[PDB]
Amino acid sequence: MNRLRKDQLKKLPVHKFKKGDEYDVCAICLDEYEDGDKLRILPCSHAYHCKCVDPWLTKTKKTCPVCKQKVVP
């Protein structure tokens, strides 16, 4: 169908943001990451806030916005 189910989403890693991380700005909301934020890490290594890309993945496409690769096998 080209979107993810909840149970598929839960298979993707969640990362808590920390100061030394390379992640800097979320390319969907265009806000800086902050010390507690929850990031969704796609298997291609592209990352977003959970709150920003989860609706994308479950209502728009199950492919990475940047590299267009499917996020589940």
Residues that bind Zn ion (CB under 5 A): 26, 28-29, 44, 46, 49, 52, 64, 66-67
7 vs 54 by CB, closer to Zn ion: 54
Residue among 45, 39, 40, 33 at smallest CA distance from 8? 40
* 53 and 3 Cβ atoms separated by less than 8 Å: no
Largest CA distance in the chain: 38
7 vs 24 by CB, closer to Zn ion: 24
As beta bridge partners, residue 44 has none
Tell the smallest beta-carbon distance from residue 32 to Zn ion (Å).
9
Tell the smallest beta-carbon distance from residue 1 to Zn ion (Å).
20
